[PDB]
Design a protein around this ligand. Structure first.
Ligand code: F6C
Ligand code: CLA
Ligand code: CLA
Ligand code: CLA
Ligand code: CLA
Ligand code: CLA
Ligand code: CLA
Ligand code: CLA
Ligand code: CLA
Ligand SMILES: CC1=C(/C=C/C(C)=C/C=C/C(C)=C/C=C/C=C(C)/C=C/C=C(C)/C=C/C2=C(C)CCCC2(C)C)C(C)(C)CCC1
Ligand code: SF4
Ligand SMILES: [Ca+2]
Lengths: 739, 46, 139, 80, 61, 42, 31
């Protein structure tokens, strides 16, 4: 046996190469470690989270340091609309002179990368102006990461290891994370906007050297304590304000103008300050809801176990039995992780959907490649988080759910009609797939046969009505905010729609992404997205709800979350584990997010080109997507290098093929299965033993990758190729045609 | 066979055509197939 | 020592490897009524001798396949035995374990790994958290 | 090594023992079924995990269950 | 031997208790020192070529 | 000039040595360390 | 005007502090 892995004697006694593979795969599955107790489980997790937080801070420190060291932040300040931000320098000793010249751009005298993460726009909005300020922030994050690294070590020492009861105290954690982690942090950020960011946007420098004696508002804090809060909203930035200058600049620190700053085409800084002020108050209030040590406050266990509605006998909230759930969540780390991943997935989708439509950073809406990168980045991350939410939901069913303590509650009821849930999800998927694909190919045949007028073109009237209800007067509807006489627009009792004039100006502006005009081409792709959402949910939900077992495998819970199969008997049981459903769902998540990002990218490409008519007429049939989006926009990408020379797109050309290669390799792991390779490896084992001069010999017997391992490795190549191929195409097709 | 194509893609992307496997760089002439063509052409007298 | 004459075989590539000399090896011995051709478990054909034979095999499954599917089913030979041979020379007879073939019930054999319930009554894994006991091993 | 368990629904049909390619199973006297015998797994160290025994088992659900566990040289079916 | 290299000495920081070990150590020391010195000398003597190497200047032609 | 890798940033000699160190000097010793770690007998 | 030689060297020395503390935490978690 070997010392490695320390956490599994079963793996440590494995005499094959499978031991090394499985040690890395199960290293962070702390619950399955040898001799693991519940208290040691939480303590190890707590220190691990300190390490992850330090890694995040070091990562942010590296981004700041390389911009301050090798970027062009100060030059980019003077002309954000025409200067290309620099990510970092390039040192590839294999470059030739044509490659060196091609990557020497953006005002630099050495090869550089062009930043597409938007950190230049973000740091510019929050008041950073000099490379020294970026450098101090980078040094500060190095020390902050050191603090959390020490904290993780400290909370593993015997005197500072928290007890299991400390981890299980849900009510104090919710109070502190709502009021303090969310509320106080929001209040502190609003303070940074009021004290630093807003003055810097008006040509006034505020730093650590002078912020103590430089009030952000002339009225001072006296206006706050005397109830004269309206003084903070007086004299806002004028519509002719120039960012980073006092020309046309007001003095208000908390306005509620709405819309966009006319020059930067982004949200008002004073609006964002008042946003985080109001958010802080709401979250600090929410952080007092639950009882910790002073009697006042709700008890979550009591609320879930409650059976009386002001005297009347009820099953529970909404007349639904929620009893026994408090212990279910509080004892299941996978249940908690499922909610946390799902919440972050929705938050990441909302980030993508709301940052492109309402840009919060100065001039970031005019950096087309950055806009495409940020939307695609946060949607794909959201899709991965959504898969993880249901993956750990399936883990919860097997490992942490017991029917006895959940008898008759709402969680047990879901498991008792899983067939109805899965069958109806299957019906929605079949209905969407049959009709969405059928209407595409109907339009394909009509357009191909020179009969584009015979296409079925269903108008997205329901979504157009919502846009009109939000103030979009393009469609001619006269409802709600698009009707100036409507009670919604006037707000008849109070007329406090101080947001509406700014909001309507941004809504009806034709140069932004706020409620983009949609036609029949947009109708069909949302139904493709709905199909993708429902099928990916169907695969994940079916795997979670069948994790305990099915007719084919009644005792699946006794085999764990991830096992290869149950053998060829009973007809065959390939991909029967709940892990396999998550494995299959990643394929559908990638496909769905492919449709989502294809739609976002092509629509914005047409708008940025000035050729909106191309998308409107070609997106209604699939050949339009294949020809006018894929084939048409690949031309400049695939010419990054050619027999005539190389340009700055050579990296995206090479990475484009690199993604295709990784995608192709995945097919080998996914199509060919283990027994073929084990027999081949046996032949190579014979050859090595019979060959002279080959003094090496395996300490670990070479074996083919396991059945589950092959699915994971193939899925990893498939995903990496998926991301690399589209990322290269997304950057090259946008940056090659724009800044 | 294939990894030398990957070699050619990387050399071309680097702007180093002289390091490629090509007629104008590091040549790989199929001399045996060229010899057969010359033999079969000279057999009939052409 | 194990006695018997090895079958006529000209050599093959599917024979023993380093594992036979390092970890363990298996030997199957049987008696045949006549000289006849059988199939080696790892490919090729061999000729079993007139008397009693002795074949060295890399894995135990080779002996079960040869003795079970060829010697018994095809050649009506029911006296084959499988031994496990260790590098130190220790040899133990492992099949049939007690002289009676496993498929035939024999007195004195104890019940091993028997669970006194139907498979549907295995406890949920949530009940056995941090105890190290699998649901199928639960009492 | 893999773990092979036999449950009380066994009917003593001896089919799992005959199907085993490494002689892990044997039939032992019993009284819970008409056949007066039940499957046993005294030699699970030789079990490869092929699950041929489960395929042969005629009861519903299975009277014999194989749980793949720690991998050894003989459980991986390695001749080297 | 006197001191830490005697038979009964238990000095864990001085484990070469045999003369043959010391002579083999000395041979290795001499050969390795000459090799490392020559390697550094060759790297420094070709510092212009190696600097062009590490900057990609050898890819002009 | 654009015939060589250069750097206008401070201490441009740092990538000149750090790129070789991290990518084709240290990684093999690092792999040796990990290999010894994962092969040690109990 | 980007950072100077001294600032880059200072950042390298400062990064040693989280570097050593990362090693301490990693070895502690290994226990
Ligand atoms: C160690 C030791 C050893 C040895 C000695 O000693 C050997 C040898 C042999 C002979 C006999 C032969 C011929 C050769 C050739 O040509 O091919 C290869 C190449 C190469 C290059 C190989 C390599 C070599 C060595 C390894 C060297 C090393 C050195 C380095 C540099 C180190 C470094 C270190 C650092 C730290 C990184 C072979 C082979 C084969 N392999 Mg084989 N090896 C081994 C290892 C290994 C591993 C790990 C794996 C996994 C990956 C495999 C794999 C494989 C396959 C697939 C196959 C095939 O096919 C082949 C054959 O069979 O035919 C017939 N195999 N191999
Ligand atoms: C033989 C092929 C070859 C090789 C070996 C290299 C080697 C290198 N190139 Mg390079 N290059 C090549 C061909 C090649 N190049 C070609 C053909 C082109 C086009 C002309 C370029 C263009 C190019 C540019 C433009 C740049 C490089 C850079 C680099 C260096 C960084 C290492 C790297 O590329 O990623 C290796 C990757 C890793 C070691 C991974 C790090 C480990 C992390 C933790 C993985 C995490 C994964 C992540 C979290 C998940 C994905 C996230 C993503 C979605 C954002 C390295 C010296 C960069 C550089 O200068 O670096 C200083 C750089 O900016 N190259
Ligand atoms: C006001 C007091 C306060 C504050 C600020 C925090 C802050 C934090 N706690 Mg925490 N905690 C507190 C009191 C507090 N705690 C109390 C009283 C208890 C005991 C009941 C705990 C018990 C506790 C545990 C057990 C754990 C934490 C963890 C964390 C960290 C979560 C990771 C992170 O950065 O989230 C991101 C922070 C944001 C502001 C982002 C929120 C944005 C969202 C997506 C929008 C909505 C975070 C730094 C975790 C940890 O170890 O981290 C090191 C963890 O596992 N806490
Ligand atoms: C195609 C989808 C996509 C796109 C366009 C982006 C876009 C972005 N990501 Mg991103 N990301 C994605 C998916 C995506 N993400 C997913 C699924 C993950 C989870 C692993 C991440 C994890 C991630 C991290 C951890 C970071 C980013 C960052 C960034 C930004 C800078 C990098 C860049 O120019 O784009 C990316 C351009 C690409 C072509 C992506 C492919 C890159 C490699 C080749 C993929 C293969 C990885 C590796 C080679 C294989 C393993 C080794 C940019 C906004 C960085 C950031 O925040 O900036 C400060 C950052 O640090 N991303
Ligand atoms: C905060 C988020 C979070 C947390 C704490 C966890 C935590 C956990 N997950 Mg989980 N998961 C998440 C998000 C998260 N996950 C998401 C978003 C998904 C969807 C993709 C999943 C999908 C998932 C599955 C399908 C499984 C788990 C499992 C596990 C547990 C064991 C971890 C393991 O296998 O060892 C550590 C594992 C690895 C390090 C995997 C290797 C890396 C993979 C292959 C990615 C490829 C690397 C890539 C090329 C580059 C990435 C960057 C690089 C630095 C690694 C552990 C409790 C497993 C479990 O509980 O088993 C029963 C399990 O089967 N999770
Ligand atoms: C182009 C690729 C592709 C297509 C079209 C499908 C299609 C489908 N998959 Mg699927 N899948 C794929 C790739 C694909 N998959 C891959 C690569 C994976 C990863 C392994 C999966 C994993 C996967 C899972 C895990 C699940 C699906 C499901 C589904 C179905 C849900 C959608 C639906 O009902 O629409 C309607 C059906 C279609 C659009 C299919 C085409 C119908 C044809 C066009 C009708 C033509 C009739 C005509 C007379 C035929 C001519 C005669 C001919 C027989 C000779 C559907 C049959 C889900 C499912 O079955 O739920 C019901 C499900 O659970 N798939
Ligand atoms: C050229 C026109 C065309 C074509 C070829 C199809 C083709 C199809 N449609 Mg469809 N459909 C169309 C126009 C068309 N549709 C129009 C204009 C509408 C109105 C918006 C619908 C509404 C519709 C629904 C609501 C459903 C279909 C379904 C189907 C599929 C099976 C239909 C069938 O008879 O199966 C043979 C029929 C059976 C096997 C059983 C009968 C099923 C019917 C549809 C339901 C029973 C009717 C009853 C009133 C209950 C209605 C429930 C509803 C209110 C929710 C098939 C792919 C079904 C589907 O996709 O299933 C997955 C389905 O449920 N279609
Ligand atoms: C994953 C990707 C994804 C997803 C999920 C969506 C989803 C959506 N997009 Mg969308 N979009 C995407 C990608 C995506 N998009 C991409 C890539 C682009 C390109 C940039 C767009 C561009 C886009 C535009 C331009 C617009 C949308 C809009 C919408 C929404 C349509 C609303 C609608 O018609 O409902 C219609 C529903 C009704 C009219 C309601 C009817 C009454 C119902 C039944 C309620 C009844 C009363 C109720 C029960 C009481 C309330 C109870 C409650 C308190 C619990 C929908 C949420 C539209 C929108 O509204 O955005 C906000 C819109 O204008 N999208
Ligand atoms: C995580 C943050 C991060 C990242 C991804 C990068 C990325 C890069 N740096 Mg870098 N750097 C960082 C932080 C970071 N830096 C910090 C904080 C400093 C100041 C000490 C430096 C100082 C620095 C110099 C002096 C040089 C680079 C260079 C480079 C490039 C080549 C890699 C290299 O030589 O590393 C060198 C790395 C260091 C000298 C120290 C890095 C210190 C960070 C904090 C380590 C982070 C560890 C990480 C979080 C743990 C990963 C966990 C794993 C599971 C993934 C590459 C683009 C080279 C370059 O520009 O080439 C053109 C170069 O010469 N870096
Ligand atoms: C402790 C530590 C450290 C330190 C380190 C050091 C001190 C290092 C050094 C290092 C070194 C100092 C190294 C060296 C090396 C060397 C080598 C690697 C060599 C090689 C050589 C060769 C290869 C040679 C060869 C030859 C011969 C043999 C003969 C002929 C000729 C020739 C030349 C070829 C630090 C602070 C960082 C950090 C913390 C910890
Ligand atoms: S096959 Fe099933 S029923 Fe028959 S003896 Fe074996 S365990 Fe019992
Ligand atoms: Ca050259």
């Amino acid at each position: 046996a070997t010392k490695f892995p320390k956490f599994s004697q079963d793996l440590a006694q494995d005499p094959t190469t499978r031991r090394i593979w499985y040690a890395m795969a199960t290293a962070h599955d702390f619950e399955l470690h040898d001799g693991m107790t519940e208290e040691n489980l939480y303590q190890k997790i707590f220190a691990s989270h300190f390490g992850h937080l330090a890694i995040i801070f070091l990562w942010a420190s590296g981004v700041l340091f390389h911009v301050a060291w090798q970027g062009n932040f100060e030059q980019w300040i003077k002309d954000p609309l025409n200067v290309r931000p620099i990510a970092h320098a390039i040192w590839d000793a294999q470059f030739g002179p044509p490659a060196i010249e091609a990557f020497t751009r953006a005002g630099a005298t050495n090869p550089v990368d062009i930043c597409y993460s938007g950190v230049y726009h973000w740091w510019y909005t929050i008041g950073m102006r000099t490379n020294n300020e970026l450098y101090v922030g980078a040094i500060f994050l190095l020390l902050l990461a050191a603090l959390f690294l020490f904290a993780g070590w400290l909370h593993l020492q015997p005197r500072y290891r928290p007890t299991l009861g400390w981890f299980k105290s849900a009510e104090p954690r919710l109070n502190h994370h709502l009021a303090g982690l969310f509320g106080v942090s929001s209040l502190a950020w609003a303070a940074h906007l009021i004290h630093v960011a807003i003055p810097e946007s008006r040509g006034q420098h505020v730093g650590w050297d002078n912020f103590l004696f430089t009030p952000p508002h002339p009225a001072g804090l006296g206006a706050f304590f005397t109830g004269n809060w309206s003084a903070y909203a007086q004299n806002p930035d004028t519509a002719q304000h120039v960012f980073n200058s006092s020309q046309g600049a007001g003095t208000a620190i908390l306005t509620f103008l709405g819309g966009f700053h006319p020059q930067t085409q982004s949200l008002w800084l004073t609006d964002m300050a008042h946003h985080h002020v109001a958010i802080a108050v709401l979250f600090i209030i929410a952080g007092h809801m639950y009882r910790t040590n002073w009697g006042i406050g709700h008890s979550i266990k009591e609320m879930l176990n409650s059976k009386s509605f002001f005297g009347a006998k009820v099953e529970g909230p909404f007349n639904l039995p929620h009893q026994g759930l408090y212990d279910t969540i509080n004892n299941s780390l996978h249940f908690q992780l499922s909610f946390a991943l799902a919440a972050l997935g929705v938050a990441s989708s909302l980030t993508a959907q709301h940052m492109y439509s309402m840009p919060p950073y100065a001039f970031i809406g005019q950096d087309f490649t950055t806009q495409a990168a940020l939307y695609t980045h946060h949607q794909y991350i959201a899709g991965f988080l959504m898969v993880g939410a249901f993956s750990h939901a399936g883990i919860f069913w097997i490992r942490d759910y017991d029917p006895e303590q959940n008898k008759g509650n709402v969680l047990d009821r879901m498991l008792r009609h899983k067939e109805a849930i899965i069958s109806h999800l299957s019906w929605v998927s079949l209905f969407l797939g049959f009709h969405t694909l059928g209407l595409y190919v109907h339009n394909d045949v009509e357009v191909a046969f020179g009969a584009a007028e015979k296409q079925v073109l269903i108008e997205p009237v329901f979504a157009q009505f919502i846009q009109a209800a939000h103030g979009k007067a393009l469609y001619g509807f006269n409802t709600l905010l698009s009707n100036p006489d409507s009670i919604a627009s006037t707000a008849w009792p109070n007329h406090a729609n101080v947001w509406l004039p700014g909001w309507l100006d941004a809504v009806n502006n034709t140069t932004n992404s706020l409620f983009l005009t949609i036609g029949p081409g947009d109708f069909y792709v949302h139904h493709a997205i709905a199909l993708g959402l429902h099928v990916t949910t169907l695969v994940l939900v079916k795997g979670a709800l069948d994790a305990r077992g099915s007719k084919l495998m009644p005792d699946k819970k006794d085999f764990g979350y991830a096992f290869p199969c149950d053998g060829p008997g009973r007809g065959g049981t390939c991909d029967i584990s709940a892990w396999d459903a998550s494995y299959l769902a990643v394929f559908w998540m990638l496909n769905t997010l492919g449709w989502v990002t294809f739609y976002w990218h092509w629509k914005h490409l047409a708008i940025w080109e000035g050729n909106i008519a191309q998308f409107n007429e070609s997106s209604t049939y699939l050949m339009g997507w294949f020809r006018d989006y894929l084939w048409l926009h690949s031309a400049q990408l695939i010419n990054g290098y050619n027999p005539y020379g190389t340009n700055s797109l050579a990296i995206w050309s090479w990475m484009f093929l690199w993604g295709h290669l990784a995608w192709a390799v995945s097919f080998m792991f996914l199509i060919t299965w283990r027994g073929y390779w084990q027999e081949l490896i046996e032949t190579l084992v014979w050859a090595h033993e019979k060959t002279p001069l080959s003094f090496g010999y395996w300490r670990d017997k070479p074996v083919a990758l396991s059945i589950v391992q092959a699915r994971l490795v193939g899925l990893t190549h498939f995903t990496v190729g998926y991301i690399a191929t589209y990322g290269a195409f997304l950057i090259a097709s946008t940056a090659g045609k724009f800044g | 066979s294939f990894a030398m194509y990957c070699h050619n893609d990387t050399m071309r992307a680097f702007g180093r055509p002289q390091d490629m496997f090509s007629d104008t760089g590091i040549q790989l002439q199929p001399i045996f197939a060229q010899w057969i063509q010359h033999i079969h052409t000279a057999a009939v007298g052409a | 020592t194990l006695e018997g004459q090895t079958p006529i075989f000209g050599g093959g590539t599917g024979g023993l490897l380093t594992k036979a000399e390092r970890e363990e090896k298996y030997v199957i011995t049987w008696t045949s009524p006549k000289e006849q051709v059988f199939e080696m478990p790892t490919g090729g054909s061999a000729i079993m001798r007139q008397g009693k034979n002795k074949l060295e095999i890399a894995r135990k499954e080779y002996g079960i396949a040869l003795g079970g599917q060829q010697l018994r089913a095809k050649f009506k030979i029911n006296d084959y035995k499988i031994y496990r041979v260790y590098p130190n020379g220790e040899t133990q007879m492992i099949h049939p374990a007690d002289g009676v073939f496993p498929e035939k019930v024999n007195q004195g054999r104890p019940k091993v790994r028997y669970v006194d319930r139907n498979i549907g009554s295995n406890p949920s894994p949530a009940k056995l958290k941090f105890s190290g006991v699998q649901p199928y091993d639960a009492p | 090594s893999h773990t092979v368990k036999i449950y009380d629904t066994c009917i003593g049909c001896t089919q799992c023992v005959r199907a085993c390619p490494t002689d892990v199973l044997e039939m032992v006297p019993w009284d819970g079924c008409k056949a007066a015998q039940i499957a046993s797994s005294p030699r699970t160290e030789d079990c490869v995990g092929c699950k041929r025994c489960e395929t042969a088992c005629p009861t519903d659900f299975l009277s014999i269950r194989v749980y793949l566990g720690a991998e050894t040289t003989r459980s991986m079916g390695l001749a080297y | 031997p006197r001191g830490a290299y005697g038979s009964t000495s238990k000095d864990s920081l001085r484990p070469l208790r045999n003369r043959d070990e010391w002579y083999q150590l000395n041979g290795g020391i001499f050969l390795g020192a000459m090799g490392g010195a020559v390697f550094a000398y060759l790297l420094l003597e070709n510092f212009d070529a190696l600097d062009s190497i590490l900057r990609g200047g050898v890819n002009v032609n | 000039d654009m015939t060589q890798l250069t750097g206008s940033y401070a201490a441009s000699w740092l990538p000149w040595i750090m790129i070789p160190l991290i990518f084709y000097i240290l990684p093999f010793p690092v792999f040796a360390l990990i290999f010894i770690w994962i092969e040690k007998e109990a | 005007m980007n950072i100077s030689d001294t600032q880059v060297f200072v950042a390298l020395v400062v990064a040693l502090l989280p570097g050593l503390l990362a090693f301490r935490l990693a070895t502690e978690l290994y226990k």
